[PDB]
Amino acid sequence: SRAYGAMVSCHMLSELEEVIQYKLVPERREIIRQIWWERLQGCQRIVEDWQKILMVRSLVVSPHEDMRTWLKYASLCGKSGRLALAHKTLVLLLGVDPSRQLDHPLPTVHPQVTYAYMKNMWKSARKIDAFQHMQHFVQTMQQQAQHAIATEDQQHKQELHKLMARCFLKLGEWQ
């Protein structure tokens, strides 16, 4: 447990070598990203360590390029009593600020990011407006899914149904 800090340092150095591999090899990009995700999952859930590792990985990977990792990091920060940093990460992922445009409904692009932002807002005690955004998001998801159902997009439809199931459960619990 004492050496874990130096272990984190070794993790960062190994990540840097995999970063130069990422820059050199264009066919290794997906494999490297999956390796990074699994290794980060293996590491401990300390916000400082996660921030260091993600800062190292940011050299060749923009947050938009890998939404899942930053979503997990934002969830960790939210559970670690750092809702300010979690909101900053969520707004960076979204690309626009829902806080300034309260009247403007939440963007539908990146629905996972929108759902994460909504639940963070719920944790931010803005429950009523979170519920209104939840209803708007669910109706938008259903209309979008009905419009965009196609034989080509089936995995996307399955993921959308899973997210919608989570949204309906959250709607019921919040009601």
Ligand X SMILES: O=P(O)(O)O[C@H]1[C@H](OP(=O)(O)O)[C@@H](OP(=O)(O)O)[C@H](OP(=O)(O)O)[C@@H](OP(=O)(O)O)[C@H]1OP(=O)(O)O
| Bind-site residues | 79, 119, 166
Cα distances from 23 to residues 38, 68, 111, 117, 126, in angstroms, run 20, 21, 30, 32, 43
For residue 166, state whether it binds ligand X (rule: CB under 6 A).
yes
Task: Supply the minimum distance, in Å, between the C-beta of residue 58 and ligand X.
Answer: 20
Q: Residue from 75, 80, 124, 140 that binds ligand X (CB under 6 A)? A: 75
| C-beta closer to ligand X: residue 64 or 166 | 166
Count Cβ atoms below 10 Å from residue 51 Cβ, excluding itself.
14
With b for 16 or more beta-carbon neighbours within 10 A and e for fewer, the 72-104 pattern comes to bbbbbbbeeeebebbbebbbebbeeebeeeeee
Cβ–Cβ under 8 Å, residues 116 and 90: yes
Question: Which residue has its beta carbon closest to ligand X?
Answer: 75
Is the four-CA dihedral 90, 91, 97, 99 of positive or negative sign? positive
| C-beta closer to ligand X: residue 22 or 115 | 115
Question: Token digits for 114?
Answer: 């929108």
For residue 68, state whether it binds ligand X (rule: CB under 6 A).
no
Task: Supply the minimum distance, in Å, between the C-beta of residue 48 and ligand X.
Answer: 18
Task: Supply the minimum distance, in Å, between the C-beta of residue 91 and ligand X.
Answer: 16
Kindly determine how many residues on this chain lie close enough to bind ligand X according to the rule CB under 6 A.
6
Cβ–Cβ under 8 Å, residues 142 and 119: no
Task: Supply the minimum distance, in Å, between the C-beta of residue 150 and ligand X.
Answer: 25
Binding residues for 1D-myo-inositol hexakisphosphate, by number, are 79, 119, 166
For residue 104, state whether it binds ligand X (rule: CB under 6 A).
no
Residues 107-146 touching ligand X, rule: CB under 6 A, are: 116, 119
Cβ–Cβ under 8 Å, residues 14 and 40: no
Contact positions vs ligand X (CB under 6 A): 72, 75, 116, 119, 166, 169
